[PDB]
Amino acid sequence: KFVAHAASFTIFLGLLVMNAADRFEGTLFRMKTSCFSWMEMLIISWVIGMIWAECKEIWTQGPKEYLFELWNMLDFGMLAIFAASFIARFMAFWHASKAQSIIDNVKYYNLARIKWDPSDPQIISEGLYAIAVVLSFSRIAYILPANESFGPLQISLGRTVKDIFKFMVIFIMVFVAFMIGMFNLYSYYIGAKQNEAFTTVEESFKTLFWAIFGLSEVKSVVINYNHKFIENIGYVLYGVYNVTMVIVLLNMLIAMINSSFQ
Amino acid sequence: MVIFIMVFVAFMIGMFNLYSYYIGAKQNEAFTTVEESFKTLFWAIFGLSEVKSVVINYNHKFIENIGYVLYGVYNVTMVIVLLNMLIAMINSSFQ
């Protein structure tokens, strides 16, 4: 049974890889794009089987017992997104089906990708399907514990994640502190800055998050105007943010080393 | 490296599926092909991959925001996996 279910999982991973095999090396009009290929048909069948397997699991285990395990929520989420992607794809298929059946209203579905609506179901389908594929690769956690060399690594990895989640409370508090502070400083200079950063709350969150991995430049503090007082305030707050973050990350690293030895 | 490979391949296929259609739309070729997606994610380990590899020129901000989340989740997952490797290797030296 373990080999049969592990072999089924490896086929589903193989289908996901080979689904985009046409564009591995490189890449009405919307009628062609909407249709499902034979690879897509198998993937839909696998997802339906996974949903039914989850339904039987929730039926016998009970809603309370099933919901208590947090990893089952992750496995339920990836199947919901996979169903979400395919229904959005079908909506784009049916809308193009009406347009082709007619042959103005039909004008939209002849357009190329550059002119698509931002909320096109085709766009939503591809965005969700990318998330589902990433999440579907996380079902290896049901097969890794069997192996005697990979099982200990998963157990050790789970302990690391739980410890990091403990320190995320302090990390969040410092993150939100500077995110609001930096946003209040640069909200007025929306068009003055060299690059949009700390201008909006979403943009301030994005800049400070990527600053953790050193992927945010220092020029996000610079302003084009002559107001060097506010720019110097930004340099201090951004500099204090990095010092505080490396201190918090250093404290987390040392405390996790202790936890391993204790 | 077994766990590291599994996480690497997970995002490599996921990011490629997201950005395969916007081959010419993106500011720089990254996550466009499987080879290009592998190259971008590998160099992201050493902080040598920019964040603008997620940005698209088109108005489709839904897919761009999906790319920001997946790329951000990838870095968090990688630093977690690298942190777990570092701590476990320190233990192995002392044991």
Ligand SMILES: CC(C)CCC[C@@H](C)[C@H]1CC[C@H]2[C@@H]3CC=C4C[C@@H](OC(=O)CCC(=O)O)CC[C@]4(C)[C@H]3CC[C@]12C
């Ligand atoms: C806690 C988990 C386990 C619940 C189940 C998974 C959800 C997180 C999934 C299931 C259905 C998904 C939704 C299905 C369809 C949509 C509509 C879609 O609408 C838009 O495109 C927003 C408009 C725009 O594009 O700007 C936004 C994503 C969303 C909410 C998806 C977000 C993720 C959802 C809620």
Ligand SMILES: CC(C)CCC[C@@H](C)[C@H]1CC[C@H]2[C@@H]3CC=C4C[C@@H](OC(=O)CCC(=O)O)CC[C@]4(C)[C@H]3CC[C@]12C
């Ligand atoms: C365990 C499983 C069975 C639960 C899965 C729940 C989904 C099947 C439901 C929940 C929310 C629904 C979604 C709510 C919003 C949308 C957005 C919609 O796209 C649009 O926003 C329309 C835009 C336009 O018409 O211009 C496509 C259908 C979809 C994904 C719906 C498809 C069906 C969804 C994903």
Ligand SMILES: CC(C)CCC[C@@H](C)[C@H]1CC[C@H]2[C@@H]3CC=C4C[C@@H](OC(=O)CCC(=O)O)CC[C@]4(C)[C@H]3CC[C@]12C
């Ligand atoms: C195909 C690409 C995109 C992903 C690369 C890894 C995958 C092929 C996945 C899918 C199936 C998985 C395999 C399914 C079968 C097995 C055998 C299994 O054997 C055991 O350790 C059990 C030993 C015992 O039975 O006592 C270990 C996990 C493993 C290697 C799994 C490892 C991860 C695999 C190879």
Ligand SMILES: CC(C)CCC[C@@H](C)[C@H]1CC[C@H]2[C@@H]3CC=C4C[C@@H](OC(=O)CCC(=O)O)CC[C@]4(C)[C@H]3CC[C@]12C
């Ligand atoms: C006791 C501590 C923990 C709380 C109080 C902190 C202050 C002592 C420090 C922290 C940040 C410092 C400020 C950061 C940078 C500036 C900008 C500076 O203005 C300029 O750079 C001049 C610009 C120009 O020349 O055009 C005036 C001092 C001030 C407010 C500093 C004054 C002293 C401050 C408020």
Ligand SMILES: CC(C)CCC[C@@H](C)[C@H]1CC[C@H]2[C@@H]3CC=C4C[C@@H](OC(=O)CCC(=O)O)CC[C@]4(C)[C@H]3CC[C@]12C
């Ligand atoms: C239970 C967990 C482990 C699995 C389910 C994960 C979801 C709860 C999260 C993960 C990534 C999230 C998505 C990442 C970012 C977006 C893009 C967002 O679309 C926009 O950014 C709007 C763009 C615009 O305004 O034009 C819609 C919500 C959504 C799908 C998020 C919905 C909630 C998601 C699916």
